[PDB]
Amino acid sequence: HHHHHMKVVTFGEIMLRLSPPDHKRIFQTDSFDVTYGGAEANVAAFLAQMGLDAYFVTKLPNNPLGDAAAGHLRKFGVKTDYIARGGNRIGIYFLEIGASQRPSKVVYDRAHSAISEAKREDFDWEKILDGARWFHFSGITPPLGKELPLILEDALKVANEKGVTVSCDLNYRARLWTKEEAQKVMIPFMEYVDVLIANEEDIEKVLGISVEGLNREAYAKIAEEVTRKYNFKTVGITLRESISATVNYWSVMVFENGQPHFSNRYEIHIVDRVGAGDSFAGALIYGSLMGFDSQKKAEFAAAASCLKHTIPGDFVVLSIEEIEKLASG
Amino acid sequence: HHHHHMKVVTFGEIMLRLSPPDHKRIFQTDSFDVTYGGAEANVAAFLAQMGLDAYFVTKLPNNPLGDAAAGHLRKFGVKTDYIARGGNRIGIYFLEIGASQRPSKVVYDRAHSAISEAKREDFDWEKILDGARWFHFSGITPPLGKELPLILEDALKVANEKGVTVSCDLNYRARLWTKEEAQKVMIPFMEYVDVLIANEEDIEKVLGISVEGLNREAYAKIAEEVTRKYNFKTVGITLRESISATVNYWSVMVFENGQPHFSNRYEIHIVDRVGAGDSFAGALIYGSLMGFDSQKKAEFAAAASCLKHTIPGDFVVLSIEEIEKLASG
Amino acid sequence: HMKVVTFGEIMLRLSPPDHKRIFQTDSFDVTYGGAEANVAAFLAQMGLDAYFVTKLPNNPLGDAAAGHLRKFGVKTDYIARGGNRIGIYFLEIGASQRPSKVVYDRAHSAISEAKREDFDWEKILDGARWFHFSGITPPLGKELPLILEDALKVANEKGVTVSCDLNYRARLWTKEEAQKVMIPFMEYVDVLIANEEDIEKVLGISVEGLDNREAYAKIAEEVTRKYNFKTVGITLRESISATVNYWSVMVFENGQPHFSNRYEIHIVDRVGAGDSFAGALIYGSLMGFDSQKKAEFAAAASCLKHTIPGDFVVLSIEEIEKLASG
Amino acid sequence: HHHHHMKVVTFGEIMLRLSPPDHKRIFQTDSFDVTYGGAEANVAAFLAQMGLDAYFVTKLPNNPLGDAAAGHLRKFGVKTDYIARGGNRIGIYFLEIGASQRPSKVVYDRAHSAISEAKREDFDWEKILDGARWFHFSGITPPLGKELPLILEDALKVANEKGVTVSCDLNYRARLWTKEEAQKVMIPFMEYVDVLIANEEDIEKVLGISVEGLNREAYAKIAEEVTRKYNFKTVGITLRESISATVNYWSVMVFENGQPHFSNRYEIHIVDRVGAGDSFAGALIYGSLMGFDSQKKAEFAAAASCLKHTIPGDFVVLSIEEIEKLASG
Amino acid sequence: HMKVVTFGEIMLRLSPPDHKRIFQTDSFDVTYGGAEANVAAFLAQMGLDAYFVTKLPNNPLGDAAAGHLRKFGVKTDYIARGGNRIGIYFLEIGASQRPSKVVYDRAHSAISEAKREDFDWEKILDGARWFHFSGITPPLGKELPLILEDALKVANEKGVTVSCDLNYRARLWTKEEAQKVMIPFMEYVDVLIANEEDIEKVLGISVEGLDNREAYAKIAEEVTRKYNFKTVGITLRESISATVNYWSVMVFENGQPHFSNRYEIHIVDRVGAGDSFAGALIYGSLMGFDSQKKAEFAAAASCLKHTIPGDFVVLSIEEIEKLASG
Amino acid sequence: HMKVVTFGEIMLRLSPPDHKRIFQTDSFDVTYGGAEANVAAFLAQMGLDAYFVTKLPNNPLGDAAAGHLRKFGVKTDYIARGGNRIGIYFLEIGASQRPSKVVYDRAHSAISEAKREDFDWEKILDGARWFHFSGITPPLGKELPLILEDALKVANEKGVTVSCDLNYRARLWTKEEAQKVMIPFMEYVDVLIANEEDIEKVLGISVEGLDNREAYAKIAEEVTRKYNFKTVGITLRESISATVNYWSVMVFENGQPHFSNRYEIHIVDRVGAGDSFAGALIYGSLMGFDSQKKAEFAAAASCLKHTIPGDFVVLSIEEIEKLASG
Ligand SMILES: [Ca+2]
Ligand SMILES: [Ca+2]
Ligand SMILES: [Ca+2]
Ligand SMILES: [Ca+2]
Ligand SMILES: [Ca+2]
Ligand SMILES: [Ca+2]
Ligand SMILES: [Ca+2]
Ligand SMILES: [Ca+2]
Ligand code: NI
Ligand code: NI
Ligand code: NI
Ligand code: NI
Ligand code: NI
Ligand code: NI
Ligand code: NI
Ligand code: NI
Ligand code: NI
Ligand code: NI
Ligand code: NI
Ligand code: NI
Ligand code: NI
Ligand code: NI
């Protein structure tokens, strides 16, 4: 395959991730494995791994943790040109990777991070989105801090001025806001969104839309409903069946041109499920940029996000060939 | 929830545990993961993790390994006030954690440990059990050394004088004694025991009681029989189905007020099964102290001991909430 | 056994292994530590009933910090629980000409936001033979100056001996800012622990040629004239590099300086060395050591800490005395 | 059991193996786990682990990596007397251990290794095979370098002169040669071979023999066909069903005295499948030397090679007792 | 920002941890490095637009080497991809009287087999303010002498400053062999980096008493007389052991030597120290440092590298200047 | 090649990493070692047919100890198997003023309980050119004095050269107790390895000023007068700390002392240094080295061991000779 100099931009928070090794709990550990990630950072890293020009937009402190996060992004091919520098700390999360009946557990320590306290003037959206074929954000970001909803609105107005394709992964988190606040903020943003990425909870909570029996017919019906209300070009929906922390079934649906497309369903023994939804989003963006047919978009993105479940950390380490090889069985 | 200053006491041996990492065998390893545990120590650590005043009674050498074992107990909240100090060495076991068709393998090196050589005068049972709501021992202990049966008898006579509730986990080990010696020693102790913890082998071997088809009806019948012979207030019995070293099914039964109560049955991908029976015992003791109904005692203790299978080491790292969350599905 | 009490912030410490920089590492070694926690750990290791007073979140890091303290024998009965997070610092352990480097991430810790009602000083200090605090603590949060004042007034009323390690930090406050808060506290301090730097910035006292015993004796008598301390203990690090330092202490008592043996140390981890000096000085005061034994014992103890990874000593009295006797 | 001073010889390449820990990919890792192995080395290590006099014949460089490989062989009991020393480098392979839908991935770096460039004069086959009861090689070796086919032919002519039993594991690798070149080279060697070890692909590719439905009857028929063409005393065939990188089913067939013998079929959660085929071969050689009946040869070798799947690295760490214990259920 | 360019081979480096020998280890620490890659990493760390030119295989090791370079800020646009493997070296990090030991495994690397068409020098060196190479590179493969000549002719035509680190290696070629290839290259070198050894074997120039400042000044003026370099930079390691060395540099410019402060170093990892000297000297030339500041800055930078695990510096300008100012 | 034989106990050694104390560690590094095992490993590394005689349990630790021995080239043919356990020691590797610390756990090891019938000395020592043992072994168990006597009588009958490393240990026996058992053994010892301490306690010989060459020469001639050894080899550690020591040896032969070069060592792991001195002295005797070459070679070898983690050397003859030649 070939590198494609197609400029893609994502925006949000990247955090230091601290996880004990070997299914140890925080209480018991003499060390933490270190990596860096976040929903929109993980998407950028996917798109860079596929050979596009992925830029991640954020703010990091000028300290060694901010330097490391930036260098981690670059290692995976993500361009860091639009990372603002300043503020007091990097956000952190501690992750206990679960097993069997013990779920994974996250302790967040992200408050008062440099991005959370970012100002509208920190970002030149006209410069950032110049020449961009795509802009991606998630619902995790608006509630992180005071100016963040205004910062996204700034970005989305420029995207719209420039004719840039806009995706959103709804990513509802009850830790961050109530479904009422999420709806108050996110529904207006849907005017700017062309491609919706979600799961069923995200749609009930953030959009207030629901159907009985969530069954392909039901998922097809939900996507029609969101499509009729918001006129999305594409709806991508993830379908996780959480048997335990060790085994999940996984599949996706892509809805476009009025029609649902279901991928193969995989049974996965999980190494690290973190980032799997983001790799779905990455793959769906990638497929749309490449002009994949709708069925192939579903199979490719299911394959990619299945594979992420096998890779330690938040970012995929994947080639196009590896993903296609899985999708092709 | 709240801390409960209810004094609970357990007695036995705590050992240094040496396990290679990553399913390595002893022969191949350049290192050993270090932890400290033992049947009755593990029970104390469970009760401390639930917020009771758990004291573990034992003897350890005055050397850094004895200091570390004591400090490991304290870290988990266990009170070390009644640990006698003296003797020559700490007992050790090496553990190879198995996988799939390869079972876990233990090499013991516990002989001539400070506890094995403990004397009756090492322990002031009147001081130890003053104010105790509960006393717990297991069948692993009597055969460890010369005075240990007399030391337990000393403890049990005081418990009985003070009206302290007494539990025993039979824990038959053929490495330690024959079923004939175990029966000769353990049957007399049953006079002092209020709550029996066992599996089916333990009851056939140590008590000489058995039934065909070990089937809920059969397990219910065995518990009636032991209850009629020894007048136990409670019988808790573990039910492991050992598919491989990687997957087991797990469930428990609590028999009280003439009636059996079976928990949910879990299919577990195992991280570390060591201590799982002890956490059952811990949870059953905890439930009895709290006045849980009989069904809830079974579900809570099944949940807790299931979860132990997911946690590296011998001790649980668990909150009440985590256990209840599992039990409630 | 004798009840001793210290108060301050304990933090999760994260350090790369093997002299790695934060930028290059894929893991951090984990421990828990803090000036006054480290003192309590010292005293616990010497066999005293040491209680550490602080506040931690109800989360696994808070749980692990408290467990670490208990592991070392410290009593955690008076740890308040609540708040949103534990404070953190990241530490690159340096080598040769590259100094160690700390990145602090302690703002908005449960302790920084503690309220005075969180701490029952009458109950905490009942039966206590000693109370230690440091100048790291007051600048950490809005009510900590008042929390410390509550404790010091109760210590005064119960007649409990009081030590303070000045521990000036520029990151946390200004030379002027320290002076406004600490100098009133000296009214209740019996034993001062400090260095040249802390004395200048916090106490407004300075003498030539300290970067010489007579100079050091002079500063200690001037300090003692002004605030009437029973004891002044000063650590004397000669910092050739992050690998090799010369190390000694002075104890000033009964109007006389007492200088320890001078150790040349190849350092494993110097964090907590000052704190083990303070612990050792406290212990030596409780055990009626003569001033010179007090200096040798505290020098030997704090030299040894440099050899032990992490913030807490792992030491016996026999071990400390073996070194001091050479 | 007893040591048996029966001299067995194997020949081929041993490589340095570099694998990231914990299912990490090469791209992401700050380290590599180190071990040494190779098809015929792994066989020698099996036979040494069973208590025979196993010699491995190869060439290694005089550098610390060659010293380490030799010392690794000796640690497992393999005699290194006939290792030639010389050349420029040791061969290497990097291995990513897969999980679930992500397969294991090998990057080879074996070209220009000391063995690849070995000369016929490097080996004194008359000395090497003096007193040997058995000689083993695999199809991986001929294509590694220029003289290697001639070196094997030298060995096989002496084996035949001395009446030494000869086994071959066909081990077809498309990375190394085409099925046409493999057939051109390997078919002539079958004249010297008494015991064939293979899977179905190996037989189609290297021997050009095939049957519909690869079903015990079909596998039995393939073994008859190879037996009628080449007059093999024994055919051992491995049967892997590759569900994912995490779970495989595994069983074997031994065909001798005109009759097939199928082992028990195991479902394995895999730790490290590398070497599993070689342990089968090892076990089949061992069984033949001991005079095991044909069914027992199949059960014992299935058991052993199942167990290898549970052991990190290329070599088994196994006792006779452990294998028999599995086979006996 | 200023575009600087270096060219050579980057390798996977495998080292046992904890002073273990290859024979005893069950793991290797992984990093990526090479003389000129290390220079680019230095310049990237100082904030220049540093591009490293080489060739790597399309495999995960090739991917990881390029990612490591990017992590450190190096631009990888001009890395050609193809070939069969990456070069490797194994490194036992020594201690005290046991020297470090390298086993090379670099033959038949993608770079060793590179062709001249693999590199578009007009595009690579367009806008470049500097081009650095070393004498490690020409002997690595059949076309590398001609590849280097292509680059140097383009550097000359664009008026781009050129540095060369002689880096004589006996494993790779003979004293006679170096001389035939390198001396013609000196025609395009403006800044020479070298040591006593490299100068004797590669340049055919020798002076007594170098195993003394006047001796070192004498060799640098003789070199400068013969080849007319703008700058000569010489590192001066005094190798007591694998643990402790004395370290200084000389910069010779405007017909005068300039000797740095001399550092006594307890070494963490000395690999790449010479390369960080070269990077620091390049950076100092681009920033118009006076000769003496240039020596102090480069000495301080290369001293610091000894404290940092791996081949690349992790350093800021402020950090280097802090040391140099003492 | 020449068959050499040593006898004693090999143990599982468990040490925390990274200068951690036993109390603080969540893992132990694993190796296998013991005085005479370490000697055999040395001789095997020099290319001799070295056999180590002992007894181990039939368990995985016993298996791994024997495998470790084979890895290093040692022949394990004469290891008896049975008994209940392997002996263990735990080792905290110290730093600076904190000495290393050993906790022994060797009682009731398979070797401690060995019987004389376990060892066929006629077969073991047939064709042997050398037999080495140490004074660590006799006190370990009831029959070991008699086992050693069986071996020594057979060595005497076959005319096999005999070395003994006195290795007095206070933990294992008293100064008086050593004397009753060892002095009769001296009748069959040709080469003595010892230190000031071992000579006083075991041999009842003492001289002033040894904590000076003339003092050391005097003790060696007194030893030689009394027991008529062909060679006396004495190691001379000057223990500044657990980090830096000065190191030299003396070989006394033909009625003359021979003192080696003195090495200043930054220590990685000093365990087994004395044993590699003994191995080196044995090797030097078998190869006809002159006394002074014998001292330099053994000093260099044992200096190098200090740089290598674990109990066994990983060394070549060329490596040892390279150091000795400086
Ligand atoms: Ca394709
Ligand atoms: Ca509850
Ligand atoms: Ca790492
Ligand atoms: Ca692991
Ligand atoms: Ca058998
Ligand atoms: Ca380390
Ligand atoms: Ca290792
Ligand atoms: Ca650890
Ligand atoms: Ni582009
Ligand atoms: Ni990274
Ligand atoms: Ni209480
Ligand atoms: Ni612990
Ligand atoms: Ni801790
Ligand atoms: Ni005095
Ligand atoms: Ni044999
Ligand atoms: Ni090995
Ligand atoms: Ni499974
Ligand atoms: Ni890197
Ligand atoms: Ni000048
Ligand atoms: Ni070993
Ligand atoms: Ni030093
Ligand atoms: Ni002489």
mmCIF file with all atom_site columns, C-alpha atoms in Angstrom, chain A residues 30, chain B residues 31-34, chain F residues 15-17 20 24-29:
data_model
loop_
_atom_site.group_PDB
_atom_site.id
_atom_site.type_symbol
_atom_site.label_atom_id
_atom_site.label_alt_id
_atom_site.label_comp_id
_atom_site.label_asym_id
_atom_site.label_entity_id
_atom_site.label_seq_id
_atom_site.pdbx_PDB_ins_code
_atom_site.Cartn_x
_atom_site.Cartn_y
_atom_site.Cartn_z
_atom_site.occupancy
_atom_site.B_iso_or_equiv
_atom_site.pdbx_formal_charge
_atom_site.auth_seq_id
_atom_site.auth_comp_id
_atom_site.auth_asym_id
_atom_site.auth_atom_id
_atom_site.pdbx_PDB_model_num
ATOM 1  C CA . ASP A 1 30 ? 5.573  -2.011  43.361 1.00 0.00 ? 30 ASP A CA 1
ATOM 2  C CA . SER B 1 31 ? 13.597 -14.788 39.473 1.00 0.00 ? 31 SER B CA 1
ATOM 3  C CA . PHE B 1 32 ? 10.761 -15.427 41.907 1.00 0.00 ? 32 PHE B CA 1
ATOM 4  C CA . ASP B 1 33 ? 7.815  -13.186 42.709 1.00 0.00 ? 33 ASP B CA 1
ATOM 5  C CA . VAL B 1 34 ? 7.605  -12.823 46.470 1.00 0.00 ? 34 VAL B CA 1
ATOM 6  C CA . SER F 2 15 ? 18.786 -11.582 46.348 1.00 0.00 ? 15 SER F CA 1
ATOM 7  C CA . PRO F 2 16 ? 16.563 -8.532  46.023 1.00 0.00 ? 16 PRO F CA 1
ATOM 8  C CA . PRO F 2 17 ? 17.307 -6.393  42.975 1.00 0.00 ? 17 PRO F CA 1
ATOM 9  C CA . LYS F 2 20 ? 16.643 -3.384  47.972 1.00 0.00 ? 20 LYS F CA 1
ATOM 10 C CA . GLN F 2 24 ? 11.012 -4.131  50.938 1.00 0.00 ? 24 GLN F CA 1
ATOM 11 C CA . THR F 2 25 ? 11.181 -6.504  47.973 1.00 0.00 ? 25 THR F CA 1
ATOM 12 C CA . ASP F 2 26 ? 8.451  -8.161  45.907 1.00 0.00 ? 26 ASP F CA 1
ATOM 13 C CA . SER F 2 27 ? 10.940 -10.310 44.087 1.00 0.00 ? 27 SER F CA 1
ATOM 14 C CA . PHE F 2 28 ? 14.246 -12.134 44.393 1.00 0.00 ? 28 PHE F CA 1
ATOM 15 C CA . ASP F 2 29 ? 16.819 -12.630 41.665 1.00 0.00 ? 29 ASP F CA 1
#
